[PDB]
Design an enzyme around this catalytic site. Sequence first.
Site, PDB file in Angstrom:
ATOM      1  N   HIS A   1       0.745  -1.305  -0.094  1.00  0.00           N
ATOM      2  CA  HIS A   1      -0.048   0.201  -0.021  1.00  0.00           C
ATOM      3  C   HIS A   1       0.920   1.203   0.004  1.00  0.00           C
ATOM      4  O   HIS A   1       0.425   2.247  -0.745  1.00  0.00           O
ATOM      5  CB  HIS A   1      -1.073   0.115   1.153  1.00  0.00           C
TER       6      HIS A   1
ATOM      7  N   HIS B   1       5.438   6.319   7.566  1.00  0.00           N
ATOM      8  CA  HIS B   1       5.237   5.960   6.032  1.00  0.00           C
ATOM      9  C   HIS B   1       4.816   7.012   5.021  1.00  0.00           C
ATOM     10  O   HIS B   1       4.446   8.069   5.862  1.00  0.00           O
ATOM     11  CB  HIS B   1       4.366   4.743   6.028  1.00  0.00           C
TER      12      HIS B   1
ATOM     13  N   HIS C   1       3.956  10.831   7.464  1.00  0.00           N
ATOM     14  CA  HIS C   1       2.989  10.572   8.531  1.00  0.00           C
ATOM     15  C   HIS C   1       3.717   9.993   9.636  1.00  0.00           C
ATOM     16  O   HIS C   1       4.108   8.813   9.437  1.00  0.00           O
ATOM     17  CB  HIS C   1       1.695   9.766   8.106  1.00  0.00           C
TER      18      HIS C   1
ATOM     19  N   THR D   1      -6.237   7.317   7.559  1.00  0.00           N
ATOM     20  CA  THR D   1      -6.603   7.674   6.147  1.00  0.00           C
ATOM     21  C   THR D   1      -6.723   6.285   5.429  1.00  0.00           C
ATOM     22  O   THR D   1      -7.751   6.490   4.404  1.00  0.00           O
ATOM     23  CB  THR D   1      -5.536   8.771   5.556  1.00  0.00           C
TER      24      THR D   1
ATOM     25  N   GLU E   1      -2.167  13.358   1.439  1.00  0.00           N
ATOM     26  CA  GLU E   1      -3.343  13.183   1.923  1.00  0.00           C
ATOM     27  C   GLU E   1      -4.065  14.662   2.240  1.00  0.00           C
ATOM     28  O   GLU E   1      -5.333  14.816   1.672  1.00  0.00           O
ATOM     29  CB  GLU E   1      -3.252  12.044   3.196  1.00  0.00           C
TER      30      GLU E   1
ATOM     31  N   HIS F   1       2.610   8.877   1.617  1.00  0.00           N
ATOM     32  CA  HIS F   1       1.772   8.868   0.344  1.00  0.00           C
ATOM     33  C   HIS F   1       2.269   9.838  -0.638  1.00  0.00           C
ATOM     34  O   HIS F   1       2.918  10.942  -0.277  1.00  0.00           O
ATOM     35  CB  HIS F   1       0.451   9.351   1.004  1.00  0.00           C
TER      36      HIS F   1
END
Length: 237
Positions: free
Chosen positions: A53, A83, A108, A187, A95, A85
């Site tokens: 992911h 991690h 994050h 999220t 995000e 995004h």
Amino acid sequence: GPEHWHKDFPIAKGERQSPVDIDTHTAKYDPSLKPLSVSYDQATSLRILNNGHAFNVEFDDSQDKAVLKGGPLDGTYRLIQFHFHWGSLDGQGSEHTVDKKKYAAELHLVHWNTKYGDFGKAVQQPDGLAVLGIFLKVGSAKPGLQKVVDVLDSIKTKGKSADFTNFDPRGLLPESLDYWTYPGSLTTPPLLECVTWIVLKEPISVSSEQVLKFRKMVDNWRPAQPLKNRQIKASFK
Ligand SMILES: [Zn+2]
């Protein structure tokens, strides 16, 4: 994907979901917010792992060896992992958003409240996790980040992991810890509403050479969620 999360995870239509847009006009400065303390001098990274992911750097949360106090939070929160995004084109990928403005990426740093005795029991409470949200603008290089991007290819695919020790998360902080904060959720599924968000105004930099090595898995974020009843408070006047 995200549009069909409400099927298996109906918290998704909940009254506290994340991320949110941060319209700065309404985001009223709260001066009762104490300032943000970060003791990461003994942070012990263990692993980096692509979980199919994103990629998570795991930490030792066995004792208060890397903790987050102050800001809006009551007590000590332990760093468990961080991690990212990130997007395909670079005017999309974060995000959270500021006046609908979007960064290349969001980092994050995830912490859990020691009130509750482990992550498992923390995620079940509203004051369970505190997630320290940092934006990435592409620009000047990031030496903090460099130790990470390096090893990204020894975890190409979903499930692969690696040893990853003496990573210093303070390399990921900006020079200004001014922040917005609101109550929200994970999220990603299970989208549990167990999170005091701490989103920082100041982004860090990453080089083009760094964002490209992060793909060689894109647009792995989630649309702005309804703000509903919630106020966003701000640490800066
Ligand atoms: Zn995240």
